[PDB]
Write a protein that binds this DNA or RNA. Structure first.
Ligand SMILES: CC[C@H]1OC(=O)[C@H](C)C(=O)[C@H](C)[C@@H](O[C@@H]2O[C@H](C)C[C@H](N(C)C)[C@H]2O)[C@](C)(OC)C[C@@H](C)C(=O)[C@H](C)[C@H]2N(CCCCn3cnc(-c4cccnc4)c3)C(=O)O[C@]12C
Ligand SMILES: [K+]
Ligand SMILES: [Mg+2]
Ligand SMILES: [Mg+2]
Ligand SMILES: [Mg+2]
Ligand SMILES: [Mg+2]
Ligand SMILES: [Mg+2]
Ligand SMILES: [Mg+2]
Ligand SMILES: [Mg+2]
Ligand SMILES: [Mg+2]
Ligand SMILES: [Mg+2]
Ligand SMILES: [Mg+2]
Ligand SMILES: [Mg+2]
Ligand SMILES: [Mg+2]
Ligand SMILES: [Mg+2]
Ligand SMILES: [Mg+2]
Ligand SMILES: [Mg+2]
Ligand SMILES: [Mg+2]
Ligand SMILES: [Mg+2]
Ligand SMILES: [Mg+2]
Ligand SMILES: [Mg+2]
Ligand SMILES: [Mg+2]
Ligand SMILES: [Mg+2]
Ligand SMILES: [Mg+2]
Ligand SMILES: [Mg+2]
Ligand SMILES: [Mg+2]
Ligand SMILES: [Mg+2]
Ligand SMILES: [Mg+2]
Ligand SMILES: [Mg+2]
Ligand SMILES: [Mg+2]
Ligand SMILES: [Mg+2]
Ligand SMILES: [Mg+2]
Ligand SMILES: [Mg+2]
Ligand SMILES: [Mg+2]
Ligand SMILES: [Mg+2]
Ligand SMILES: [Mg+2]
Ligand SMILES: [Mg+2]
Ligand SMILES: [Mg+2]
Ligand SMILES: [Mg+2]
Ligand SMILES: [Mg+2]
Ligand SMILES: [Mg+2]
Ligand SMILES: [Mg+2]
Ligand SMILES: [Mg+2]
Ligand SMILES: [Mg+2]
Ligand SMILES: [Mg+2]
Ligand SMILES: [Mg+2]
Ligand SMILES: [Mg+2]
Ligand SMILES: [Mg+2]
Ligand SMILES: [Mg+2]
Ligand SMILES: [Mg+2]
Ligand SMILES: [Mg+2]
Ligand SMILES: [Mg+2]
Ligand SMILES: [Mg+2]
Ligand SMILES: [Mg+2]
Ligand SMILES: [Mg+2]
Ligand SMILES: [Mg+2]
Ligand SMILES: [Mg+2]
Ligand SMILES: [Mg+2]
Ligand SMILES: [Mg+2]
Ligand SMILES: [Mg+2]
Ligand SMILES: [Mg+2]
Ligand SMILES: [Mg+2]
Ligand SMILES: [Mg+2]
Ligand SMILES: [Mg+2]
Ligand SMILES: [Mg+2]
Ligand SMILES: [Mg+2]
Ligand SMILES: [Mg+2]
Ligand SMILES: [Mg+2]
Ligand SMILES: [Mg+2]
Ligand SMILES: [Mg+2]
Ligand SMILES: [Mg+2]
Ligand SMILES: [Mg+2]
Ligand SMILES: [Mg+2]
Ligand SMILES: [Mg+2]
Ligand SMILES: [Mg+2]
Ligand SMILES: [Mg+2]
Ligand SMILES: [Mg+2]
Ligand SMILES: [Mg+2]
Ligand SMILES: [Mg+2]
Ligand SMILES: [Mg+2]
Ligand SMILES: [Mg+2]
Ligand SMILES: [Mg+2]
Ligand SMILES: [Mg+2]
Ligand SMILES: [Mg+2]
Ligand SMILES: [Mg+2]
Ligand SMILES: [Mg+2]
Ligand SMILES: [Mg+2]
Ligand SMILES: [Mg+2]
Ligand SMILES: [Mg+2]
Ligand SMILES: [Mg+2]
Ligand SMILES: [Mg+2]
Ligand SMILES: [Mg+2]
Ligand SMILES: [Mg+2]
Ligand SMILES: [Mg+2]
Ligand SMILES: [Mg+2]
Ligand SMILES: [Mg+2]
Ligand SMILES: [Mg+2]
Ligand SMILES: [Mg+2]
Ligand SMILES: [Mg+2]
Ligand SMILES: [Mg+2]
Ligand SMILES: [Mg+2]
Ligand SMILES: [Mg+2]
Ligand SMILES: [Mg+2]
Ligand SMILES: [Mg+2]
Ligand SMILES: [Mg+2]
Ligand SMILES: [Mg+2]
Ligand SMILES: [Mg+2]
Ligand SMILES: [Mg+2]
Ligand SMILES: [Mg+2]
Ligand SMILES: [Mg+2]
Ligand SMILES: [Mg+2]
Ligand SMILES: [Mg+2]
Ligand SMILES: [Mg+2]
Ligand SMILES: [Mg+2]
Ligand SMILES: [Mg+2]
Ligand SMILES: [Mg+2]
Ligand SMILES: [Mg+2]
Ligand SMILES: [Mg+2]
Ligand SMILES: [Mg+2]
Ligand SMILES: [Mg+2]
Ligand SMILES: [Mg+2]
Ligand SMILES: [Mg+2]
Ligand SMILES: [Mg+2]
Ligand SMILES: [Mg+2]
Ligand SMILES: [Mg+2]
Ligand SMILES: [Mg+2]
Ligand SMILES: [Mg+2]
Ligand SMILES: [Mg+2]
Ligand SMILES: [Mg+2]
Ligand SMILES: [Mg+2]
Ligand SMILES: [Mg+2]
Ligand SMILES: [Mg+2]
Ligand SMILES: [Mg+2]
Ligand SMILES: [Mg+2]
Ligand SMILES: [Mg+2]
Ligand SMILES: [Mg+2]
Ligand SMILES: [Mg+2]
Ligand SMILES: [Mg+2]
Ligand SMILES: [Mg+2]
Ligand SMILES: [Mg+2]
Ligand SMILES: [Mg+2]
Ligand SMILES: [Mg+2]
Ligand SMILES: [Mg+2]
Ligand SMILES: [Mg+2]
Ligand SMILES: [Mg+2]
Ligand SMILES: [Mg+2]
Ligand SMILES: [Mg+2]
Ligand SMILES: [Mg+2]
Ligand SMILES: [Mg+2]
Ligand SMILES: [Mg+2]
Ligand SMILES: [Mg+2]
Ligand SMILES: [Mg+2]
Ligand SMILES: [Mg+2]
Ligand SMILES: [Mg+2]
Ligand SMILES: [Mg+2]
Ligand SMILES: [Mg+2]
Ligand SMILES: [Mg+2]
Ligand SMILES: [Mg+2]
Ligand SMILES: [Mg+2]
Ligand SMILES: [Mg+2]
Ligand SMILES: [Mg+2]
Ligand SMILES: [Mg+2]
Ligand SMILES: [Mg+2]
Ligand SMILES: [Mg+2]
Ligand SMILES: [Mg+2]
Lengths: 271, 48
RNA sequence: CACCUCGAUGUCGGCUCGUCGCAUCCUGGGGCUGAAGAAGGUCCCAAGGGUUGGGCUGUUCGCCCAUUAAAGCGGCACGCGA
RNA sequence: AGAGGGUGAGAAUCCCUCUCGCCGUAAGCCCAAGGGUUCCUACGCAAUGGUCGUCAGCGUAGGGUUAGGCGGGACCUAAGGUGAAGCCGAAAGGCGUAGCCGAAGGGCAGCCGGUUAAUAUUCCGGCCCUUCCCGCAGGUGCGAUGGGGGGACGCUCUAGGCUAGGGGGACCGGAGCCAUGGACGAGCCCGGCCAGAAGCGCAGGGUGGGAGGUAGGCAAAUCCGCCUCCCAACAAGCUCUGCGUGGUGGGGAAGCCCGCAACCCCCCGAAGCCAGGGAGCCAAGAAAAGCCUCUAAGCACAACCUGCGGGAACCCGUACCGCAAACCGACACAGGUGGGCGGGUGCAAGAGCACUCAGGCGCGCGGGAGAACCCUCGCCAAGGAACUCUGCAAGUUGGCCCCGUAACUUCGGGAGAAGGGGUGCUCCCUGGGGUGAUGAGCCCCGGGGAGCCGCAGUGAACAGGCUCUGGCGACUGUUUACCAAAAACACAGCUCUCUGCGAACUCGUAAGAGGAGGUAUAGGGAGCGACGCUUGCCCGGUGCCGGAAGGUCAAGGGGAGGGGUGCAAGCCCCGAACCGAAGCCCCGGUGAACGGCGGCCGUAACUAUAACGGUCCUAAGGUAGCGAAAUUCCUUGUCGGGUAAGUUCCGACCUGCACGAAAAGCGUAACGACCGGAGCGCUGUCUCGGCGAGGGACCCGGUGAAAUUGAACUGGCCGUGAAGAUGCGGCCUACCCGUGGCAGGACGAAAAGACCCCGUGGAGCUUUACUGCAGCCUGGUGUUGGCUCUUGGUCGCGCGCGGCUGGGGGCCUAACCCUCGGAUGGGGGGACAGCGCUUGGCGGGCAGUUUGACU
RNA sequence: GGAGGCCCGAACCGGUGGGGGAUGCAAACCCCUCGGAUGAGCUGGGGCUAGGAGUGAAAAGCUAACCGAGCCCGGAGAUAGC
RNA sequence: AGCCAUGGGGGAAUCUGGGCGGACCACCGCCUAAGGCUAAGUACUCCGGGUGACCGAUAGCGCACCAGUACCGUGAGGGAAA
RNA sequence: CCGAGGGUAGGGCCCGUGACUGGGGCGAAGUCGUAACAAGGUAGCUGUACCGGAAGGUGCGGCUGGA
RNA sequence: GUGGGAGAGGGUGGUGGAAUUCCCGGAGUAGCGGUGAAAUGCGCAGAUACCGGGAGGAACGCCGAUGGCGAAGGCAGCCACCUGGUCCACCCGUGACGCUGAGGCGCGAAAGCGUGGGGAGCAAACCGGAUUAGAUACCCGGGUAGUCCACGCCCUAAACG
C-alpha cells in the first residue's frame, strides 16, 4: 500500500512510509538462524571508499538462505513474514518440518502457514525453489543462482522478478529485471515467484533525515567543490562543468560504458 | 575553549608508548635515535 | 610627467571641528542701466557675520519638497580615520 | 564591606567574634578524567602570591591513603587491534580464519554507624552476604572449551504499585523566649529518623505441564527445535526482584550556667525501584562469559548437587584538587572540562525567575576624591526617525486566562496573526478531583456574589513590538574553528548515466578490502534541487553510443630484391609486395551530453507600425515564461503607486548593452537571526542635550609593565631643499619644569606593501600548452592443452592429390579462475579471462615544465 | 489517542546584531541580544582514516592556536641575475 | 654499440666444444661461463693513548658545571644558560 | 446600569478611479494570407490536446448537420 | 414465485492464431521505399524479397448483419469464474405498494492529469523531403507524449434520435 501522512509538518507532507500489512504478527527477529551482529563500517581498511555512507539506525543482520538445496525435498511451513532491515525485500522465516528454521527472502503472494519446499520434484508454486532446468518456460521467478551451488544472486530487490525465456540445453535464458537477456545454467536454483514488497519503489523518503536513518550521508555535487576536489568545481560564479560530465576521479559519467569487454561473461549475456 | 591538550594516559601510552614505538620500524628508529642521543626518557613518561 | 614616499604617506562619502581664499550667495557701499516707482540686470567695493529643515542616493553632485535675507564657490594630503 | 579582639618586630590583607553583602540546579555536595602530595600537622616568609602577608596551594620536616564484598585485575566480549592457518609485497612490511587482546558494555559478594589531625562500604561496631579448599549424613548419571536456552537489548508514550525527596500537623520530644504597643496562646524556636538477615506481608519480573514421534541444532543427547492429543487455559501455582515490616544495631536539634536522651499522623511525590513491565511506531534496534539445560570422551571407590561445618580468599587503586588557584588554556588566566545530587517559598509549570536552607563565598591591593572623557546603567520637557547606509542601537511588546483574529493556503497552516479584556486582596455561597472510608482533615482543578486599597495587582525577577510588501532559497538542517551563516552547501524529489555480480566504482603494487554478507525496487557517477506548470529548436564541431566494409595503422609475420665478408659451403646485415590490433579517419545515433539558439532590405485608401514579402548567413537561429531583473550599459529609461519631496521600493511598459527553460524557466503556501521597501507602535536615533548611578579616569600608600627609541638643546610663518622642514634662509615668536586634557604634526607605531611592476622567483589551479605517468584499450607472445568443421597464400608437380603453415566455427577438460555440508574430489568458467614480456593507442586522473622582449 | 528533522522555552549545542575588549580576563574573551533545543540532536569513553594523503551538508574547510598541500629531521650551507 | 649483467620469448653443445679481442665476416690470437671459499695490503673511529704555528667559557663538542638536562613540543623533535 | 455618539482596532459588501493590460463592438472603399459556404479544391463540424503570423493545422475519439 | 431464453451488458483471471517491428541464423543481390511525379529515407557496413527461430505489444480477421446488449458513455478471439439488466411462459403470491423527480449520489467517449508499469503499430508536438508566391499545411521518410495496463483525478462532446 504505503502510508501517506497528513502535512502536520513539512516533509511529513510528502513522506510516504512502507505498508507493513503483510508483516506476520512478529516484530523481533528469530535469533539463532539469524541474526549476526552486522559490522557497520562506511570505509574499508583505512579509508572511505564509498562516499556519503555512515550513521543510520543500527541493524541486526538477519542471515538469510540463498541456497535452498541444503533442504531438498524437506518441506517447511512459512512460520512468519518479518521485516529485515538490511533489504528492500521482506524475509520469510520458515519452520522446517526438519526442525531447522531459516529465513528465505519473501516472494509476493507468500502467506503465513503455507508449505514451501525445495527441489526438482517441487510443485511449480509460490516460494518453492528449483534448479532452473525444472522451471516451466516463461515463469516468473526470483532469487536466482547465477552459477550453480554458488548462491542466489539475481532478482532479490522487491517486486524484482525474472522470466525464464527458454532453454539452451544445459542452460536457460533469464530476463533479469535489468531487461538483460542472459543464459543461466539449468542447475542454478531459482525460486518461483517475484520478490514481493513490490511497493518498495514507491516510498517517498520525505525529510532529509530518514535518508540519514538509511545510513545515507549527504551527497555533494562535484560542481560545488573546487578544482582540487573535482572535475566540475571552481571556475566559479556557478558553472556548467566545462565538459564533459565526470566523476570525482575523472572518468566520464554520462553514458561511458564500463563493463569490461573481454569479461568471460558473454556468450552468456545478450543485450 | 577546548584546547589542544586533552590528556589521556591511555591515549598517551597507546600512542607514543614504548610498545607502540617498537611495533613500527619507524618507531624502532625513533627509540634508536633517542637512545643514541642519550635522551633520559625514550618515551613520553606516563604512569598509573 | 614619474620627482619624495612601495623596510606602508589608509584612498570615497558621512559626522565632528574648523580655518583660509574671494573669482561674493546673502546682508553693507557704489556706477551704468533698455533705472519712473517697487522690482531686476550688470559691473565695481566689500567676508564682518551669515549662508535652513527635509525626500532620494554610499554618494560627492544633483533632482526634488518646504522655507529663506541667502540657501556662495573653492583651499586646506579631493582638511580632518594615532 | 565594617568593627572588635587575638597574634605578631611588622597586620586593610593571618586567627576569632559580631555586623554587611554574594552564590544557592551553585559560586553547595558526590563521581569520573587529568593533575601527582598539592592532603594533615609543626616550624618558616628569601622567593612564588599581581599589595600586604604572621597566611598559603610557598620553604624545611614529620605524619596520612588499610578492602573477598568499592573500582580495575587472577571473568566476558564491542569497534578496533593483534594474529596460528593462509594470502601478498623489492626489503621494510600489507593483509588474514580461528584465537588472543580490547570497556565506561555484559557478569559479580556490603549496608548503616562510629572512629583520625589527615583513611575509611577498607579500620571499629552491628547485622548480611561471595568464591575457592577439605570434611560427614543423607540425595543425581556425573562429565565440556561442544549442543541448546539465557544473557539479549531501539525510539516515543505509558500503567500499577513503591522508594528517594519534600510539605504540613492541633500530635511526640525538647533547651528555652514573652522584647518594642499587643500576645502565657490548639503561642514562638528546634526536632521528630537510619540500617537491618529469615520469616512474614504488598507490589511487580520471569515462567504452561504432560505424553509420543523426530529425517534439524554438523546421526553424541532423554536438551533445543519441529510435528500430534485426555487435560490446563481471560489462572493457580512455581521461582526472582523491589518495597514494607521486621531479632537487633545506630542516630538523635534548637539551645545557656557549659552537654536533660522523642522518633508518630496526613499530604505531595519522582525521570529512581519493581525492570526482561505495558502500548504504539519504523529507521527494526551488540557481543561474549557468568547462569541453566543437554548429552561426548572419560567416569561412576569418581563426579557433580544439596546442606551444615572448618579452613582459604591474592594483585592494584584508595591523601588531596576535581567547573577549578591543584585538570586544558606560559599566569592563583572572566575561556574550556563528562556523570550524579541539587532543599524551601512564590510566580500556570519548570532545572526559568527572585529571595533563601545546607554549604560556600565577598573573587589576593588598598584609601580617598566626585573634573573632562570612557564604560555599564537610570530618567527626561515638547517633538517621535526629523538620526542614519540602515530604527544600528535602544525603546515599545512581554506570563497566564478569556474574547477575537485577514489575505492567502499545500488545506496542516498563515496564528501568539492582528487586536482587545482580565490579572491583587477580603468576605459570602456553591460544583466536581486525589487520599482517605462513603462524613472528616488533606492537597487538587474550579464557578458564582458582594467588597477594600493603590499611580499601578504576571505591583519585584524571569517576559514577543506589530503590520503590509517584494528578492533569493521550499522547508528542519550545513558552512568559511579565528573578519562571510548567506541567495552558499545539504536536502527530500527529478532526469541522465554506468553496473548481471569475482558488478560498476573506490583504496591498495599486491594480497586484501570497501561496494555488500547488498544484487536493477539495487549500487556507482552527474546534474538538477519541495511542490505546481513546463522545459522548445539545432548532432556541422566536441563528447559519448552504435557500425564483422573501407582508409590509416605498431610489434610481429612475410620474404621479392640488395649488401658485408669468406676459396668455399657459409656467417652476418639490411630489405618490396603482402597478411598485421586498438586508436584515429570514415558512417550513423545522441541535448536533464559540451554546447549554440542570426543579419539586412521593403510593405497599411492620412500619417505612426509591420501581421506579410524579399534577400544574405547559419549546424539551427531563443519556443513557452519572464523581463531597467541578485541580469538594463545608456539609466535616476518611461509611465503609474507610495511621499510634501522617492537614484530605493512596488505595478506596469519592453530596443532584454548582455533573461530564458534540470550551470532549469516561470510561479508557489510555509519557513528565514538572509537582502530590499512601506506603515503603525515606541523611543535619547535625532532636534538637543541635561541630570543622575556605579567601574575607571584624578589624588595618596603598595606593586609596576609595554611597543618605541640615530642622538636631541625637538617653536610659528613665508620661502628653500629629493618637490610636504624643530633641524636650511629670512622673519616672527618664545623665561625654566611639570600636571590633567585634546589628537593637527613628528610623512607618528605596528607588519622589509597585501595593490602595482620587476625576478629567465614559488607555488595552487586549468586546458584541445609541452612532455610524461598512473590508469584503461590493444596486437604478438609465455603460462597454453586436447577432437573435429570449414576456407586461404606459398614452391613443387599432376584446378585435383602431396609439403609447410596458419584464420574462423564449434566441442572438450586438465591447466589457470570461481565456488561447493572438508576436497586423492564435485559443480561452474575455461585455454578465455587472470598474470608476465612486448606493441601501439586513449590518457589533466597525475606529474615536471613552458607560457619572449621592448614598452 | 499522543504523532512530528512540529511550536515556546532551561540545560545542553550554537554564534545573529550590537556594544565592550583590542600590550585583552581572553592568540576568539565579556555583556546585551539572538539560532537549535526528539534530532541530519548534543555528549563521555573506546576506536579508524594523514600529507598530493585524509577528512570535508563543500569553506580549498579542517587535519595540535597561520593548511591552495601538516609538522620534524634530513638532502642543506637548496637556489636568490634580489 | 661490442663487452658485463638480465625481466621476456625461442633455445644449444662438452673441446671437430665454447666466450672474447667494439657492429659483421675472415683470418690471427686470448680465455675456458653457467658452483663455492680465500688471508694481506683498503675503509671507519664508539673506544685507549700520543701530538698540535687547535679552542680557551659568546671559543672549543650542544654539555668544561649533575646536558641531551632544564625548558619547549601530543610526538617525531627541539634544545639552553651556567 | 444602560446610553447618543466620539475613539481605537479589525473585517464584509458596494461605487468611483488607476500606469499599464486583455480581449470585445463599430467603423463607404487599409496589409497578409483563403479557413469556411459547391469534393471549397485536404468533407465538415466537433470535445480535447498540441502547434502555428493569422485564419488555421494535426493528433485522438466523436456527429453527418457529409460522400 | 416456479421454469426457461437471447445477448460485443459489466468486472477478474487465463488463454489462441494471424499480422506489424525488432533481434539471431540460413540463403541471395543492386536496389528498396515512396508518390501525381518525386525527393527525403533505407541499401555492397549487404537492405528489399524468402526461410527458420526468438522477443514484445496492441487490435481481435472470417463469422458480422441493413444484427445483438446497456440508462447513457459505450461493449466484439476463445475460456472460466463473479455479476447487472431484460424478455416469454404458467396467473401462484403481495394487494396500488405507483409515476416523475429540484437537491444529492453514481456513471460518464476521446483527449488531458498524477504515480507506477508498458510501448510493437499508429501518432499531436517536433524533424526533415516535396509542393508552393510562401506551405508553420494537405503528400512522403522519421518520430515524442499519447494511444495499453493498474490505481487516482478530469466530467467534456455533433454525450445525436
Ligand atoms: C592590534 C590587533 C590587530 O588590529 C588590526 O587588525 C588592525 C585593524 C589592522 O588590521 C591594521 C591597521 C593593519 O595595518 C594596516 O595595514 C594596511 C595594509 C595598511 C595600513 N597602513 C598604515 C599602512 C596599516 O596600518 C594591520 C595589518 O593589522 C591587520 C597591522 C598589522 C600590524 C597587523 O595586522 C596587526 C598585527 C593586527 N593583528 C593581527 C591581525 C588581525 C587579525 N585579527 C583580527 N581580529 C583579531 C582578533 C580579534 C579578537 C581577538 N583576537 C584576535 C585578529 C594584531 O594582532 O594586531 C593588530 C594590530
Ligand atoms: K607606497
Ligand atoms: Mg583490520
Ligand atoms: Mg592500520
Ligand atoms: Mg544496463
Ligand atoms: Mg548534493
Ligand atoms: Mg566553491
Ligand atoms: Mg586535499
Ligand atoms: Mg573534466
Ligand atoms: Mg581537475
Ligand atoms: Mg556567472
Ligand atoms: Mg567547472
Ligand atoms: Mg601549549
Ligand atoms: Mg581512560
Ligand atoms: Mg581518545
Ligand atoms: Mg619616481
Ligand atoms: Mg626620467
Ligand atoms: Mg619608515
Ligand atoms: Mg570650508
Ligand atoms: Mg572683489
Ligand atoms: Mg550688495
Ligand atoms: Mg546696482
Ligand atoms: Mg565664509
Ligand atoms: Mg522615510
Ligand atoms: Mg580627504
Ligand atoms: Mg579608523
Ligand atoms: Mg596621523
Ligand atoms: Mg533552589
Ligand atoms: Mg587518578
Ligand atoms: Mg611539593
Ligand atoms: Mg602555621
Ligand atoms: Mg614571602
Ligand atoms: Mg608579595
Ligand atoms: Mg592546605
Ligand atoms: Mg607545604
Ligand atoms: Mg584478562
Ligand atoms: Mg577474551
Ligand atoms: Mg573480532
Ligand atoms: Mg596486522
Ligand atoms: Mg568492565
Ligand atoms: Mg561494568
Ligand atoms: Mg564488585
Ligand atoms: Mg578528607
Ligand atoms: Mg567491617
Ligand atoms: Mg549413558
Ligand atoms: Mg553458548
Ligand atoms: Mg510540646
Ligand atoms: Mg510589652
Ligand atoms: Mg516534619
Ligand atoms: Mg527513608
Ligand atoms: Mg508444550
Ligand atoms: Mg558427532
Ligand atoms: Mg522423545
Ligand atoms: Mg526498615
Ligand atoms: Mg525482608
Ligand atoms: Mg500517594
Ligand atoms: Mg571465551
Ligand atoms: Mg567409554
Ligand atoms: Mg580512600
Ligand atoms: Mg577521598
Ligand atoms: Mg560538575
Ligand atoms: Mg585570583
Ligand atoms: Mg579559571
Ligand atoms: Mg591554570
Ligand atoms: Mg559543561
Ligand atoms: Mg512551587
Ligand atoms: Mg512561572
Ligand atoms: Mg537561577
Ligand atoms: Mg550563610
Ligand atoms: Mg523626551
Ligand atoms: Mg512626554
Ligand atoms: Mg507618536
Ligand atoms: Mg530620512
Ligand atoms: Mg539627513
Ligand atoms: Mg534593533
Ligand atoms: Mg479587581
Ligand atoms: Mg493588597
Ligand atoms: Mg529590571
Ligand atoms: Mg521582509
Ligand atoms: Mg535555507
Ligand atoms: Mg524556485
Ligand atoms: Mg559551527
Ligand atoms: Mg567564519
Ligand atoms: Mg542562520
Ligand atoms: Mg558485508
Ligand atoms: Mg542511480
Ligand atoms: Mg543549486
Ligand atoms: Mg534554482
Ligand atoms: Mg553526428
Ligand atoms: Mg550540436
Ligand atoms: Mg556529435
Ligand atoms: Mg567508437
Ligand atoms: Mg615489419
Ligand atoms: Mg583497426
Ligand atoms: Mg535544453
Ligand atoms: Mg523555437
Ligand atoms: Mg526592461
Ligand atoms: Mg526603476
Ligand atoms: Mg543582462
Ligand atoms: Mg504623487
Ligand atoms: Mg517615479
Ligand atoms: Mg534610504
Ligand atoms: Mg520594478
Ligand atoms: Mg540564467
Ligand atoms: Mg541548461
Ligand atoms: Mg522568479
Ligand atoms: Mg515566495
Ligand atoms: Mg534556519
Ligand atoms: Mg538565515
Ligand atoms: Mg543620549
Ligand atoms: Mg553624563
Ligand atoms: Mg560616577
Ligand atoms: Mg600609585
Ligand atoms: Mg626648547
Ligand atoms: Mg616648507
Ligand atoms: Mg626655521
Ligand atoms: Mg642647526
Ligand atoms: Mg600633556
Ligand atoms: Mg597628534
Ligand atoms: Mg586618546
Ligand atoms: Mg608609519
Ligand atoms: Mg619590500
Ligand atoms: Mg599540471
Ligand atoms: Mg626542476
Ligand atoms: Mg615585460
Ligand atoms: Mg604604457
Ligand atoms: Mg481523532
Ligand atoms: Mg523542534
Ligand atoms: Mg523555531
Ligand atoms: Mg556575538
Ligand atoms: Mg559572524
Ligand atoms: Mg567590537
Ligand atoms: Mg536561546
Ligand atoms: Mg526554541
Ligand atoms: Mg540519532
Ligand atoms: Mg563521542
Ligand atoms: Mg589549527
Ligand atoms: Mg608550508
Ligand atoms: Mg602535502
Ligand atoms: Mg606546497
Ligand atoms: Mg644539495
Ligand atoms: Mg658470454
Ligand atoms: Mg655474444
Ligand atoms: Mg676486431
Ligand atoms: Mg672475504
Ligand atoms: Mg681519541
Ligand atoms: Mg686522547
Ligand atoms: Mg659554549
Ligand atoms: Mg671570561
Ligand atoms: Mg653552547
Ligand atoms: Mg613534555
Ligand atoms: Mg458605536
Ligand atoms: Mg478546411
Ligand atoms: Mg478555401
Ligand atoms: Mg477543404
Ligand atoms: Mg481538432
Ligand atoms: Mg501541424
Ligand atoms: Mg539476416
Ligand atoms: Mg388477497
Ligand atoms: Mg426514476
Ligand atoms: Mg483516455
Ligand atoms: Mg498517463
Ligand atoms: Mg508522416
Ligand atoms: Mg470521462
Ligand atoms: Mg447517432
Amino acid at each position: 500500500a504505503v502510508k501517506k501522512f497528513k502535512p502536520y509538518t513539512p516533509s511529513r507532507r510528502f513522506m510516504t512510509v512502507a505498508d507493513f500489512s503483510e508483516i506476520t504478527k512478529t516484530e523481533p527477529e528469530k535469533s539463532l538462524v539469524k541474526p549476526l551482529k552486522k559490522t557497520g563500517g562506511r570505509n574499508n581498511q583505512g579509508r572511505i571508499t564509498v562516499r556519503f555512507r555512515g550513521g543510520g539506525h543500527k541493524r541486526l543482520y538477519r542471515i538469510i538462505d540463498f541456497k535452498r538445496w541444503d533442504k531438498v525435498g524437506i518441506p517447511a511451513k512459512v512460520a512468519a513474514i518479518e521485516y529485515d532491515p538490511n533489504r528492500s525485500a521482506r524475509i520469510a522465516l520458515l519452520h522446517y518440518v526438519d526442525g531447522e528454521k531459516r529465513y528465505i527472502i519473501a516472494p509476493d503472494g507468500l502467506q503465513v502457514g503455507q508449505q514451501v519446499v525445495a527441489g526438482p520434484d517441487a510443485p511449480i508454486q509460490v516460494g518453492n525453489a528449483l534448479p532452473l532446468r525444472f522451471i516451466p518456460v516463461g515463469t516468473v521467478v526470483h532469487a536466482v543462482e547465477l552459477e550453480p551451488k554458488k548462491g542466489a544472486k539475481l532478482a532479490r530487490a522487491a517486486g524484482t522478478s525474472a522470466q525464464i525465456q527458454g532453454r539452451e540445453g544445459d542452460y536457460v535464458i533469464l530476463r533479469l529485471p535489468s531487461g538483460e537477456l542472459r543464459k543461466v545454467h539449468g542447475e542454478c536454483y531459482a525460486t518461483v515467484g517475484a520478490v514481493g514488497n513490490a511497493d518498495h519503489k514507491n516510498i517517498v523518503l520525505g525529510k532529509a533525515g530518514r535518508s540519514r536513518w538509511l545510513g545515507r550521508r549527504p551527497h555533494v555535487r562535484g560542481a560545488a567543490m573546487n578544482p582540487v576536489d573535482h572535475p566540475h568545481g571552481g571556475g566559479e560564479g556557478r558553472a556548467p562543468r566545462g565538459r564533459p560530465p565526470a566523476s570525482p576521479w575523472g572518468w566520464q559519467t554520462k553514458g561511458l560504458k564500463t563493463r569490461k569487454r573481454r569479461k568471460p561473461s558473454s556468450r552468456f549475456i545478450i543485450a | 575553549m577546548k584546547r589542544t591538550w586533552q590528556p589521556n594516559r591511555r591515549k598517551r601510552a597507546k600512542t607514543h608508548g614504548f610498545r607502540a614505538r617498537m611495533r613500527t620500524p619507524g618507531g624502532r628508529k625513533v627509540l634508536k635515535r633517542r637512545r643514541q642521543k642519550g635522551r633520559w626518557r625514550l618515551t613520553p613518561a606516563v604512569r598509573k
